[PDB]
């Protein structure tokens, strides 16, 4: 009996798979990390090929867990790390070299060159985005320039590009299937979110043949079936397809203008619905949210590039805490009067500041600053920022924002969600499911294949969790974040 | 189109699938662990469905990393842990409860009964086994003791047993077939080994209803076919299967009367081919080595329940070394007399017999450190080892000039000369450590045809270092008066 969904949540360090019941319940999940690789400062790669094989191996492990066969699979859902850049050669089946990641800044110069040539406007006209390396285009381009004899072989047709989502769906079709959905197209800053295409004249602009995009279809319907052998035996459904944070909006059921959501994990990303319309994007993203039932919805997107990466740096870099779950248990015993700041900005300034020259900065260190207060303050930091973006969400779209819907691996953080509710002095509802993401894709493709009838169903199914209020006092939350501000500007003055 | 023959090789500690093409080479592999549970003294158990998962992951692992499809495996070996007991609902495929290990103690008191009862003599002669709580039988027992309504749901019929070789061809077939090779089957203490049938007597003893058993078949034959669903997609003959233990002497091409290996893996296990006319009665275990080509040829074990095992517990329980490997470093930097015996009885001590004895150290000092003692914890195993091959030489009386070894923990270069110096035999070693899954491949490509016959298998023999005596008489003696004093305390303290 066809009654599960699975979910793959291909992440910018783990790969995961998750097998959900009708009730969109876990019957069994995998994880699997793979390599990250840093050639140079500023550049983050990974190799395609590994990524595959990371989901392979949790496609395998959800099945084993759960216990139930891959014919019992209605259909497959498809979020993942978006911006990401792969590009393979279609006559070979390989990457023509590693893929870049969204984190990684070696497309700086192309991206730099762009806005000295004057095309910002253009670009957001079209895109909704600002130009950065940060998305896809620079990205295809840096390839296309430092990979001996690609543009010639783009030139041909031999070459196709592709966000990770588009990347999963050809090795599980054997290269049958090049498509792409809304979400992952809106970020790659080649794709005309208005006229809902691939902008021709972005194209041209960065030498980018047409003859490498993917198509782009809705976020919900079935764009295949999976080869035979690439499922155990059973030609699935893949249904269900998004970018990561398009795919946690969806899961959280933010599917009204104003809904918005907040997801802590390498990075952190406040995603608010605003409806079948585009108003005043200033210091964030317009983007695509999802497209289903014949409609678009748009999106407004503010991006911390480093939240949970930073702890990641804690452990490897300053190797300060040997597994980066311990930042739990040191920043809970913190003592000092919170008064360290921490601004991990180690690619740059992310919404609404978008200063790619900042760098990481600390200040209000003292001879009594412990190991835990320094933890405590790189963990706050995303806290800071998401009030930075929320607040610039309240002024562009002058909507009020009472209720922050939350998820991702870090909001498991009691601490540091009391804390995020305490500075916004707004309500942080927790969903029940961390791996909110994994639950919307999970949505995307059972309403393609109709495990699920609609949107009012799968609200009927919403679990949340925790809820935290406000609980600091306005004299209290102001004066932390005037210290944030302050943090942040003298990071930004640092510009050596 | 069907070049490939998979093992899987469920262990004690891990399980591992391995993937060899026809000139039996390792094309692609897994290994996952699974957890070990220690609820009493002396007791070992396993989650059943935690094991199945283990094997799964392997099997999944290994067509991931060689990119091979299910559709190139010709034959499946399947070769395992023995004597573990697992006890299943037949319609819901469910265990009863957690298996039963070999190493566990749990059922000591029904096997002790037993030999109470004046059973010994008549488990001797039709199993060539010794009544301990070693083999399945009174594992059965034990669960169909204490596991509220279990026997009266044998008695009607609704529960099966199974060693794990029969556990997993139970999940790969889903449930349609319920079978064990002759190896397994032998190990369980409820199989005459002579009239090559489950026993009545032995069943009535334990009031182990038959409707439990799963029919027993030799080592090399088509068993079934996998479900497409429980092996990824195809349906393929599983059609190899021994204990892991025989499946190593196979592998070792230990097909000669007198041929004789040792597996040092979570306990280390001397196996001598006897033929097919051994009935050898002695301490040692007369067993049945593999049934193949219409014969049946038995052999000679000597047991010893914890070798490796007790490395993981240095890593697991004193926490006192990072990695398992990490144990021939820190021997190696050993700077005491070597006078500190560790004696590893943590589950009784296997070929003496001895159920009561538990773990024990001797010989310390304040200068003993953590190097001594991780040394001697190591030789321990080859001590053990030679407390069975003294035993075999003098009840067999074959002489015993090489013991040829494999296993995981075979990989330490200063034990296995340990263990030729201790020995003052020639130690050789397999090319290829994991010979037990490489056995497993034989039978079952011997069975589908993958490999003409027993001979073919030889033209891909390759072996490993050998190892010669260098040590001198007077050190190899008092070392091992040492031990024999060792074991002798340790036999004082009854738990």
């Given at each position: 009996e066809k009654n599960y969904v699975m979910a793959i949540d291909q992440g910018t360090t783990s790969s995961r798979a998750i097998i959900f019941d009708r009730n969109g319940k876990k019957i069994g999940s995998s994880q699997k990390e793979f390599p990250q690789y840093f050639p140079k400062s500023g550049w983050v790669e990974h190799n395609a090929n590994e990524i595959w094989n990371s989901v392979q191996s949790v496609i395998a492990g959800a099945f084993i867990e759960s216990g139930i066969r891959p014919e019992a699979i209605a259909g497959i859902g498809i979020t993942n790390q978006r911006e990401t850049t792969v590009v393979w050669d279609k006559t070979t089946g390989q990457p023509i070299?590693?893929?870049?990641?969204?984190?990684?800044?070696?497309?700086?110069?192309?991206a730099d060159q762009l806005k000295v040539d004057g095309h910002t406007e253009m670009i957001h006209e079209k895109t909704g985005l600002v130009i950065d390396a940060?998305?896809?285009?620079?990205?295809?381009?840096?390839?296309?320039?430092?990979?001996?004899?690609?543009?010639?072989?783009?030139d041909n047709g031999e070459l196709l590009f592709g966000t990770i989502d588009s990347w999963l769906v050809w090795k599980l079709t054997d290269g049958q299937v090049h498509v792409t959905d809304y979400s992952n197209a809106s970020r790659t800053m080649l794709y005309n979110i208005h006229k809902l295409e691939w902008d021709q004249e972005i194209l041209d602009l960065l030498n980018i043949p047409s003859s490498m995009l993917p198509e782009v279809k809705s976020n919900s319907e079935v764009y295949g079936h999976t080869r035979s052998y690439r499922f155990y035996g059973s030609e699935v459904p893949i249904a269900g397809m998004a970018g990561d944070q398009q795919a946690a909006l969806f899961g959280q059921m933010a599917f009204e203008?104003?809904?918005?959501?907040?997801?802590?994990?390498?990075?952190?990303?406040?995603?608010?619905?605003?409806?079948?319309?585009?108003?005043?994007?200033?210091?964030?993203?317009t983007?695509?949210?999802?497209?289903?039932?014949?409609?678009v919805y748009y999106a407004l997107e503010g991006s911390i590039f480093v939240a949970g990466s930073a702890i990641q740096w804690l452990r490897d870099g300053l190797r300060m805490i040997e597994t980066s779950p311990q930042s739990e248990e040191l920043a809970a015993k913190a003592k000092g009067d919170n008064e360290v700041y921490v601004v991990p900005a180690f690619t740059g300034l992310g919404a609404p500041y978008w200063d790619?020259?900042?760098?990481?900065?600390?200040?209000?260190?003292?001879?009594?600053?412990?190991?835990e207060d320094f933890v405590r303050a790189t963990l706050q930091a995303v806290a800071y920022q998401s009030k930075?973006?929320?607040?610039?969400?309240?002024?562009?779209?002058?909507?009020?924002?009472?209720l922050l819907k939350v998820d991702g691996g870090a909001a498991k953080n009691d601490l540091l969600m009391q804390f995020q509710a305490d500075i916004l002095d707004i309500?942080?509802?927790?969903?029940?499911?961390?791996?909110?993401?994994?639950?919307?894709?999970?949505?995307?493709?059972?309403?393609?294949?109709?495990?699920?009838?609609?949107?009012?169903?799968?609200?009927?199914?919403?679990?949340?969790?925790?809820?935290?209020?406000?609980?600091?006092?306005?004299?209290?939350?102001?004066?932390?974040?005037?210290?944030?501000?302050?943090?942040?500007?003298?990071?930004?003055?640092?510009?050596?």
């Amino acid at each position: 009996e066809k009654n599960y969904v699975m979910a793959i949540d291909q992440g910018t360090t783990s790969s995961r798979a998750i097998i959900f019941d009708r009730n969109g319940k876990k019957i069994g999940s995998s994880q699997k990390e793979f390599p990250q690789y840093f050639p140079k400062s500023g550049w983050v790669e990974h190799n395609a090929n590994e990524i595959w094989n990371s989901v392979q191996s949790v496609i395998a492990g959800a099945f084993i867990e759960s216990g139930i066969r891959p014919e019992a699979i209605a259909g497959i859902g498809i979020t993942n790390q978006r911006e990401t850049t792969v590009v393979w050669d279609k006559t070979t089946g390989q990457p023509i070299a590693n893929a870049i990641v969204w984190q990684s800044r070696q497309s700086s110069p192309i991206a730099d060159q762009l806005k000295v040539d004057g095309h910002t406007e253009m670009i957001h006209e079209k895109t909704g985005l600002v130009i950065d390396a940060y998305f896809s285009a620079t990205k295809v381009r840096w390839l296309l320039d430092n990979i001996e004899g690609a543009q010639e072989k783009a030139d041909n047709g031999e070459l196709l590009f592709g966000t990770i989502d588009s990347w999963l769906v050809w090795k599980l079709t054997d290269g049958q299937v090049h498509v792409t959905d809304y979400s992952n197209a809106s970020r790659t800053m080649l794709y005309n979110i208005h006229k809902l295409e691939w902008d021709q004249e972005i194209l041209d602009l960065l030498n980018i043949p047409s003859s490498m995009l993917p198509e782009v279809k809705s976020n919900s319907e079935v764009y295949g079936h999976t080869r035979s052998y690439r499922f155990y035996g059973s030609e699935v459904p893949i249904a269900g397809m998004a970018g990561d944070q398009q795919a946690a909006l969806f899961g959280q059921m933010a599917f009204e203008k104003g809904m918005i959501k907040n997801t802590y994990g390498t990075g952190a990303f406040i995603v608010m619905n605003t409806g079948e319309e585009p108003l005043s994007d200033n210091d964030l993203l317009t983007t695509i949210g999802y497209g289903i039932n014949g409609k678009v919805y748009y999106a407004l997107e503010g991006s911390i590039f480093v939240a949970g990466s930073a702890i990641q740096w804690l452990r490897d870099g300053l190797r300060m805490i040997e597994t980066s779950p311990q930042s739990e248990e040191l920043a809970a015993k913190a003592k000092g009067d919170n008064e360290v700041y921490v601004v991990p900005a180690f690619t740059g300034l992310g919404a609404p500041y978008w200063d790619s020259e900042a760098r990481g900065a600390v200040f209000g260190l003292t001879r009594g600053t412990t190991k835990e207060d320094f933890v405590r303050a790189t963990l706050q930091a995303v806290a800071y920022q998401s009030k930075d973006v929320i607040d610039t969400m309240k002024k562009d779209s002058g909507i009020d924002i009472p209720l922050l819907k939350v998820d991702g691996g870090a909001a498991k953080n009691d601490l540091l969600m009391q804390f995020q509710a305490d500075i916004l002095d707004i309500d942080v509802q927790r969903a029940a499911n961390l791996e909110t993401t994994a639950l919307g894709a999970a949505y995307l493709a059972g309403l393609a294949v109709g495990f699920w009838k609609d949107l009012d169903e799968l609200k009927s199914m919403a679990e949340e969790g925790q809820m935290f209020t406000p609980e600091m006092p306005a004299e209290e939350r102001d004066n932390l974040y005037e210290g944030w501000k302050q943090a942040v500007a003298a990071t930004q003055t640092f510009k050596f």
